[PDB]
Design a protein around this ligand. Structure first.
Ligand SMILES: [Ca+2]
Length: 188
């Protein structure tokens, strides 16, 4: 097929390849995935291959789920391309609403204390133990990282974090941005 003028428009406001190039990638994608769909197991394998120093299965599953809040089924080429952009390219502040969808594990519209710990833990496993030693003491375990996040938002244990407030805080408080950071290369 051809990449629809519509998906190209979709992709080019959310990422950066070009129209023709995304078609080129698409034609190759179709050769390898004839149905134009990729399963969660297939998507996980991409992360397994390219993060040999890490244990990225949980992270990849959460990233996959951010495009349905469902684990079964598939992604299409558009979601697959956007997923790779989110994890690996561009600047974080252009990604804040997607970050919210990542952290809202159950997709119920708000973020809970446990959901922060789940995603923080998954991201934490993307970092080698070599790199883990260079992290500051008060931010070197998933529990410390996740509790610092929850405290930066002024939250009690049973509170619910809205998208409005998540965007505000990730924009304003650069310590929050550092702690919620989901691109493995940027978790320094
Ligand atoms: Ca939730």
């Amino acid at each position: 097929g051809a990449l629809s003028k519509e998906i190209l428009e979709e992709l080019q406001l959310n990422t950066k390849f070009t129209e023709e190039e995304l078609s080129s990638w698409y034609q190759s994608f179709l050769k390898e995935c004839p149905s134009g769909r990729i399963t969660r197991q297939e998507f996980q394998t991409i992360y397994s291959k390219f993060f040999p120093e890490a244990d990225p299965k949980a992270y990849a599953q959460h990233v996959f789920r951010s495009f349905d809040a469902n684990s079964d089924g598939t992604l299409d080429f558009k979601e697959y391309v956007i997923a790779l952009h989110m994890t690996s390219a561009g600047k974080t502040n252009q990604k804040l609403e997607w970050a919210f969808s990542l952290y809202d594990v159950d997709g119920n519209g708000t973020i809970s204390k446990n959901e922060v710990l789940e995603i923080v833990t998954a991201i934490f496993k993307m970092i080698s133990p070599e790199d883990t030693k260079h992290l500051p003491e008060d931010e070197n375990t998933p529990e410390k990282r996740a509790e610092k996040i929850w405290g930066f938002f002024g939250k009690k244990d049973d509170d619910k974090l809205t998208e409005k407030e998540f965007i505000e805080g990730t924009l304003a408080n650069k310590e929050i941005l550092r702690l919620i950071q989901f691109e493995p290369q940027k978790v320094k």
